[model samples]
Target chain A: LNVAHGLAWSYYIGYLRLILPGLQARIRMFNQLHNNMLSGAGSRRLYILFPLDCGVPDNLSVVDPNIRFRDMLPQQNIDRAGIKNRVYSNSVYEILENGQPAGVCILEYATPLQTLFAMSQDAKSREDRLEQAKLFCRTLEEILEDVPESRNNCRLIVYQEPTDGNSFSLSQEVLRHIRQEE
Target chain B: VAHGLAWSYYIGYLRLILPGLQARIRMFNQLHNNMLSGAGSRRLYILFPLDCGVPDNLSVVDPNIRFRDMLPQQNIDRAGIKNRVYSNSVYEILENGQPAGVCILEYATPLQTLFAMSQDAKREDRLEQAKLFCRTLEEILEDVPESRNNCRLIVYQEPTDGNSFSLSQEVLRHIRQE
Candidate 1:
């Protein structure tokens, strides 16, 4: 995740700098927080992973859109424990050979309505991205359960966060649209 | 006399930890925790020169003594570039192409501050390095005259076993001389 973000930032400054307004300011915040995390001045709460070149996705839809991940303890098991509002962030990035970003996954743990992932045009890429999202949630759940004081009631429901024609919608939708076209 | 004394007490007791002082304190403690060890006091100093006018001569004794601006990517010990983020100037004090010391300075209102540490093992060598840094500081401040007057140089000396003159003390005197 760190390497991917670092590479993605280089591309951002070069190609996407003019296309996206105030991106530098947003990146500065990320850099400061990342530096704080590195300096032990701030808490390092979450982990982001990028498994490079895992496998090629087939155009035949290797992943089922409605298929549920079956390995987790039942939702009622965690629901009975009651949910605690601990916000942990997860971001999965895909970078191309040219060091350009191909996709991004952003998930919210506490209130899971606005889970978002943008993907490449390939059928496999979309499948892999969604699988990564599900896998990240499972990992987060396991970590939460192991923490002695944490409530294990993390019921993350993944969904596409709509760009909704907001201020950033043009830039956000443009990147996704371009990636799909490419 | 009682009224004067009461007013003095009131003036002296009012203290605020301004952001600059707080940053220096934090940086000082950070280096202390990570880089410093031993029994000496005031080993790590962050000095802000207050009333020191520009030097009579802004020149180094050794022509070999030079400074190279350090990039934010470089490490200032195991701690990395946290100091670089805070400093307006971060330099590798080089003597004949080798690193002799390091100097970090922040140019700000009220007081412009600097912290320099020499890699030299001997006291005399350290003092010489400090003089070079003093020259650099004056040369730097020559461009920005606003930060020259009314500077209160903050000093932080890390604990050590032996008594040695701190680099900031020499830097303080050298900058103060007319």
Candidate 2:
């Protein structure tokens, strides 16, 4: 499997270098950043949210305020938070290979207001959620290069907003931009 | 597979005494015959009218002459004519307090021949074919135990032989004691 991955990576890198020489440096940088983030213990924390009750107030309070905990929660939390309920942007970066969708890059987003129900309870929960969100975001970013929209066949862009607390909002915008072009 | 029953007393004398003289006679006959026939080979030939053959879909018969006739032909067919064939007629005797067949007293490659003389077949009748073949070997050995030396026998059952019975064969001489 390692041999296969190495061969594939080498082939794609060569192809990308020939077709999109200008983007090669950017792609390399993205890969480096992804590897760095993934190697860190902090990156694996994201999977904890899926198993934990992130909605519980006691659980939410432990998360870091700066980290995007609310962005990762369900839509019901967003509505309860009373921040103009944005559609759960299920829109994702469709990873393509050989003109076919091979995988998807889901950009989930939530806000503090949405996560407040859980956050108000305890510091530990809040911290856990925050770590999970960060880890998830990092994973998403790491996998972006393999995603269809970010592949060499299409454009690759990274967008982030501090105030919106919605990763999906940016994803939605990006998807809309793609659809518009189509 | 060949099966025959000779007079017990004759067989006993052949086994216990006559084999040495028989061996000398056989050697002389082989040398004389080879010289006369210009056969070049220094191997002794002992002709026993025992028929050994693989019968098509037939069980082995007790005291079977057809089996005795088939023996030499089968050995020649399977192993080729280059190697000498020692066909023995064995009798079950006591070995280490067990009923062991030790009719073969002495011959070239005797142990190997004895070992290969018995076989198990898929069916009872097929097994009988193998048993009959071994019995023939045992009887022959009993007939000339002293003269036969360094003799070995093997039972080879060909898959095409419908009976699925393995047979044994060897070549050796018995010395006759006056």
Candidate 3:
């Protein structure tokens, strides 16, 4: 059980680095800003929003799934005042196409607004890339349902390694199309 | 693009070295989802490569690489690290029907440690063995939900006699690649 949790967190951080690219540095900065505060003190929980077709991974599939994951993806209490419980929660989500996990999403709720950080494997073609973007939005929609209050105040942020500039632009264009359609 | 390019190289190198890695990840996800239950003892599935000079999927069972597990009660008192070990596994390297070398991995909490080969294993073989273990550890980390923020891998060695640092160096080099 101990080995499982350690390995699970290590793997989550690895993908986080691969997808977000800048998150580690941000974490470092956050630590410095707060004198390296520890996680798991608060009642806030870590949530993993998996697609219906894609079940949670084994090592992480715990007894009370939600409680155990809080350690892997810790939440911060942005509400310094203490009473409001205005906690900032980080949740993991997977983007699936026909039951295959193609992308990873780290959805963050910092009150008032939510940020969906998304990334996918490099696409073989632009058409496929757009499909990835649509999957991103679909995950985003699912996320909104997970936290219904954030529906009106949510933001979607997609990432790609710089070498895939065209991929980055294509995803943005896909988001634009969705906006126009809505 | 500096960050992006580095990420590309990192992932590219992994794919180049580990054939069927993406598919391995897929299988890892499926097997884990079905095998692990809530509030139960956890288990890890691993695959070690053979020297067949071909790309192989470690996720699936193959007759190529030799696999086995053992209990080290004979050396328990001398096991340097301090953690209650649940089990230990070995991947033996065979050549011409003879044992070429062996890599042992221990399943323990707070740290999943690896046994470093002493003078018995070749330098090249040890490094290559370290690489496979490192890759497998990464996959294990990603798939296990029990793994969390403080989870760690004890891949290094303390300087001492009768031990070559190549294993630690190789593991360090492999991690720096990420």
Highest TM-score scorer: 3
Per-residue alpha-carbon lDDT of candidate 2 for residues A52-72, written as tens digits (9 for 90 to 100):
122322212213222222111
Worst 10 residues of 3 chain B by lDDT: B51-60
RMSD of 3: 21.2
Interface RMSD (Å), every candidate: 27.4, 42.9, 18.0
lDDT of 2 at A1: 9
- lDDT against the true structure, per candidate, is 0.27, 0.29, 0.30
Best to worst by DockQ, what's the order?
A: 3, 1, 2
Docking category for candidate 2? Answer: incorrect
Estimate the lDDT of model 2. 0.29
Off by over 4 Å in 2: A1-182, B1-123, B132-154, B161-178
lDDT of 3 by residue, A108-153 (tens): 3211010011112222133333443345445345545555434322
Q: Could you say which candidate leads in lDDT?
A: 3
- lDDT of residue A1 for candidate 1: 16
Candidate 1 chain B, run of 10 with poorest lDDT: B108-117
Fnat per candidate, as a fraction, reads: 0.00, 0.00, 0.00
**Candidates' DockQ values?**
0.01, 0.00, 0.02
Give me the displacement of residue B73 in model 2, in angstroms.
24
